[PDB]
Amino acid sequence: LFSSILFSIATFFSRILGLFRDVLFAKYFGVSYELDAYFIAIMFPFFLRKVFGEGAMSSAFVPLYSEKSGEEKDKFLSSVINGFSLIILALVILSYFFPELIINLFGAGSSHETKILAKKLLLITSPSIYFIFLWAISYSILNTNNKFFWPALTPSISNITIIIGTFLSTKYGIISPTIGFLIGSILMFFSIIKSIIKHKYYFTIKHFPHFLKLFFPTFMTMVVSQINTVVDMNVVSFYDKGSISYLQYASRFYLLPYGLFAVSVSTVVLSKISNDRKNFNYHLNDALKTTLFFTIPSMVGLIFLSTPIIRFFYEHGAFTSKDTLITSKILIAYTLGLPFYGIYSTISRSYHAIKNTKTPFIAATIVSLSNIILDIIFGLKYGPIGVALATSIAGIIGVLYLLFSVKTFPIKDFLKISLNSLIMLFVIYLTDFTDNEFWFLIQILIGILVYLIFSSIFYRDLIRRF
Ligand SMILES: [Cl-]
Ligand SMILES: [Cl-]
Ligand SMILES: [Cl-]
Ligand code: NA
Ligand SMILES: [Zn+2]
């Protein structure tokens, strides 16, 4: 629909801007115990943000808010706000009085100086949760009114404040981007405060229990799917200092091709399932093909060009050649799972599309359990790269479960796409001559052209018919 395209525009801007935030992190801080500390401090809010944000709450909030009429709707809203305010307040109190609990939750293995600094920053990040939660509620209200572009854009506020703090980091140090994180949350809330403050306030949580009853199922899938990144970070804290920062650089960069190829391309087609349930198996079939068509070649390219890509974006200022080597290898480790997490995401969102919460949940559980196990075994011994690989392998396991669940997969088109991807690989390999920092961009363009040529050869009849 119109709102999906608009949503992609808003999200695209916010994520590219986010990338610039990370790039400046590499420039001004590189890999350091202090950036580790900053990451630990912001993880708790960010964990909460990612869980609730981008309309996660909406799924349960929309039906219960929109249905009500009169000032019972206003009462409902106030009930939710008050309830969450209670939980949040408890959290912030606990944070201030037992910061070692929070620190150990996210960075148990980090060094002494890192933990001290992370406490200091925690004092600044803790209040952000309240504003993030209010931002999430406000967001939902907007979704009831079918406004999607501007809410989707608000994350850019946070990115700009953090960026600015990074620019001021040469004057104030690590605390500047932390205060920027805080202020960023505040301005994100104020940007859409009107959706909340127009209604009246009632001193009650009367409807909060019902809201929790309905919300809980979507909450559990968000927690389980997200908890993995917390586990990854926690585990790598036990490796040499700077590991958290390595993993954050690699994963934040990795989230661009994942978000673009493993999720976004499959959105449009997936919409059909919601409107045409009777043909789910057929529609799902198509979706999978779409996913593969993008994820398999990308992976190849990303792996073949991981080092030059990483060097182009990150190797400035404090970020050093050693950091490029290490981060590039981590990025490969994540990228090996790209097609598997694409398939995973497609099947999961389709099941969600036919009102099935059980299977996506179970798959999430398998992936999370596997990732914790493999993070222990491989992460502790082999550090960041081991953690990333654990994530990818876990993805493979989840894919096997889901594939045995839906009992359908486009084998023929998988083979054709893999073949075209290896032709592409062969051509880009042959063209690896100049060894110039800017050469990889050309190599991507060449690769795209090769891949589309041979795809058009192997899909001639499909292009003609359509
Ligand atoms: Cl950040
Ligand atoms: Cl209710
Ligand atoms: Cl009710
Ligand atoms: Na992992
Ligand atoms: Zn109620």
Numbering used by the authors: 4 to 469
Paper text:
The cytoplasmic-facing Lipid II is flipped to the periplasmic side of the membrane by a Lipid II flippase, after which the GlcNAc-MurNAc-pentapeptide moiety is incorporated into peptidoglycan and the lipid carrier is recycled. MurJ consists of 14 transmembrane helices (TMs), of which the first 12 are organized into two 6-TM bundles termed the N-lobe (TMs 1–6) and C-lobe (TMs 7–12). The N-lobe and C-lobe enclose a central cavity that is large and highly cationic, properties consistent with Lipid II transport. We determined four crystal structures of MurJTA: one structure in an outward-facing conformation to 1.8 Å resolution, and three structures in inward-facing conformations distinct from the published structure, resolved to 3.2, 3.0, and 2.6 Å, respectively.
Based on the conformation at these regions and the size of the membrane portal, we assigned two of the structures as inward-closed and inward-open. The Cα-Cα distance between Ser11 (TM 1) and Ser267 (TM 8) increased from 8.0 Å in the closed structure to 17.4 Å in the open structure. Superposition of all the inward-facing structures show that they align well at the periplasmic end of the protein, which highlights the importance of the periplasmic gate in stabilizing the inward-facing state. We observed systematic rearrangement of Arg24, Asp25, and Arg255 (Arg270 in MurJEC) in the cavity between the different crystal structures. In light of this discovery, we re-analyzed the Na+ site in all our other MurJ structures and found electron density in the inward-occluded and inward-closed structures as well, albeit much weaker. Because of the high concentration of Na+ in the crystal drop outweighing the potentially lower Na+ affinity in the inward-facing state, we posit that these weak densities would correspond to Na+, possibly reflecting the inward-facing pre-Na+-release conformation of MurJ.
